[PDB]
Design a protein around this nucleic acid. Structure first.
Ligand code: KY6
Ligand code: MG
Ligand code: MG
Lengths: 223, 212
RNA sequence: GGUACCUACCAAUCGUAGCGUGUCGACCAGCUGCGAAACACGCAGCUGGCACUGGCGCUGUAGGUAC
């Protein structure tokens, strides 16, 4: 019943501004202190900001003190985090959280907020080039061949990769993206499949990069 | 910042049924206003413990929280498979709130030799002026492995990127990918491309190669 | 003479002529329970201060008023 759904993430340039929204359902925000936490990619949780009930007092972390502003609209039951003069240390998944009730889970954050990614970079949005990683023609490693797709030179995160439009999920490994020397992301999504059934079965990788609004469907095939 | 929460260990590998203990030290007193959260990869945290010893409704009883002065301890008695994850501590005694560094609890299992595969570049990429050769180490444990590239026989260096997946939820293994990037001409100039993998599960380094 | 009362009784020290007494409450700080409640606001309680409130008990001296 209690849900916290946020929005507003995306890519913004250094020094730019951007606002995140956090809509709440199943409870009235005016009766709970609401917090903004963040997690940089592959980093620990970082408390960012908080707003208290009935007084409206606002508290901020040192890293963002003076640049961020937390607010709330009761008529819309939504919290807001304005972020100004953004630096490259502000890129992270931002979580909206609701502090529990005092007499049950005192000061503990029950019910967090999925999350929303904020990227701060001067690089420009670009869709990936999708290439095939064809099955090994030499032998096939004991009845199980390996194929894949290479999603290269895209920015910003994220992308989503499926196989056969969701029909294939067993033995799939979509690797985390890595920043190449060029400043763009690249990854590969591989799958292991029975080699005897290779020729008969069709394998397609579906890559979606919503930032650039690009969708690619790539065949593989043994050649 | 005001109070610092130093968490230890930064990670560990535990068998199922093992007891694990994680400790957060507050730079100064924080009373009992400490909480513990569990976070799975690609997911939001979940409240495990609040008020330095109380259990959150719905949390199993194998999770316990204790306090001794400025030291707080999360204890998982008899670690279970669904408990592998990153645990964080929080101090809410005074603003700004502080989180611990986190402790990544991964499951330990028997060693599994990797499955090594090599993938040459596609004709499209070559036409684009670049060539990416991929080496894939599939389903191995432990996470530690060594991969080296060799064209002709020149041990390559400084032109390969490495990525690795999170522990598999089904078999607890890892998968790794090395990617060697060259130019079109550079790739045409050499014949054999090979990937050499050394791992605890391989008595001898295994090589996988092809000819352009 | 008696009783009652009015006024006055250096400075310092809360106050008083002096001695004693620190409150139904005010104020300053801190703590706790509770109000959907970390601060702020509200209600109730506690601890320490303070003496705004100059009350209460006792004991006067001088002058004066009235029975
Ligand atoms: C023993 N000590 C010295 C210790 O420091 C003291 C000193 C002064 C003092 C002052 C006191 C005054 C009151 C009391 N109760 C009082 C009562 C009601 C009203 C009204 N309306 C106004 C005031 S009592 C007391 C005790
Ligand atoms: Mg005097
Ligand atoms: Mg006075």
């Amino acid at each position: 019943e209690v849900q916290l759904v946020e929005s507003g993430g995306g890519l913004v340039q250094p020094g730019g501004s951007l606002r995140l929204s956090c809509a709440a359902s199943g409870f009235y925000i005016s009766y709970s202190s609401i917090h903004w936490v963040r997690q940089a990619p592959g980093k620990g949780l970082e408390w960012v900001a908080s707003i208290s009930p009935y007084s409206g007092s606002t508290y901020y972390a040192d890293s963002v003190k003076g640049r961020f502003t937390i607010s709330a609209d009761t008529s819309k039951n939504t919290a807001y985090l304005q972020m100004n003069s953004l630096r490259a240390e502000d890129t992270a998944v931002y979580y909206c959280a609701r502090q529990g009730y005092r007499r049950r889970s005192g000061r503990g954050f029950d019910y967090w907020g999925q999350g929303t990614l904020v990227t701060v970079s001067s690089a420009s949005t670009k869709g990936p080039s999708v290439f095939p990683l064809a099955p090994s023609s030499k032998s096939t490693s004991g009845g199980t061949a390996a194929l894949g797709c290479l999603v290269k030179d895209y920015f910003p995160e994220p992308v989503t990769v499926s196989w056969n439009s969701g029909a294939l999920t067993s033995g799939v490994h979509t690797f985390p993206a890595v920043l190449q020397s060029s400043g763009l992301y690249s990854l590969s999504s591989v799958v292991t499949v029975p080699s005897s059934s290779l020729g008969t079965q069709t394998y397609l990788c579906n890559v979606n990069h919503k930032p650039s609004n690009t969708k690619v469907d790539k065949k593989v095939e043994p050649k | 910042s005001d109070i610092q929460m130093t968490q230890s260990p930064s990670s560990l590998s535990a068998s199922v049924g093992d007891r694990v203990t994680i400790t957060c030290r507050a730079s100064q007193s924080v009373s009992s206003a400490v909480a513990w959260y569990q976070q799975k990869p690609g997911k939001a945290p979940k409240l495990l413990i609040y008020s330095a010893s109380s259990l959150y409704s719905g949390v199993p009883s194998r999770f316990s929280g204790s306090r001794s002065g400025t030291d707080f301890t999360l204890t998982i008695s008899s670690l279970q498979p669904e408990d592998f994850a990153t645990y964080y501590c929080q101090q809410s005694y005074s603003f700004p709130s502080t989180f611990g560094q986190g402790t990544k609890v991964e499951i330990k299992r028997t060693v599994a030799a990797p499955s090594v595969f090599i993938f040459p570049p596609s004709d499209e990429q070559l036409k684009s002026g670049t060539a990416s050769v991929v080496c894939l180490l599939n389903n191995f444990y432990p996470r530690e492995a060594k991969v080296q590239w060799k064209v002709d026989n020149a041990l390559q260096s400084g032109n390969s990127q490495e990525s690795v997946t999170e522990q598999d939820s089904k078999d607890s293994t890892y998968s790794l990918s090395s990617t060697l990037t060259l130019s079109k001409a550079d790739y045409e100039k050499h014949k054999v491309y090979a990937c050499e993998v050394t791992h605890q599960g391989l008595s001898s380094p295994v090589t996988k190669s092809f000819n352009r």
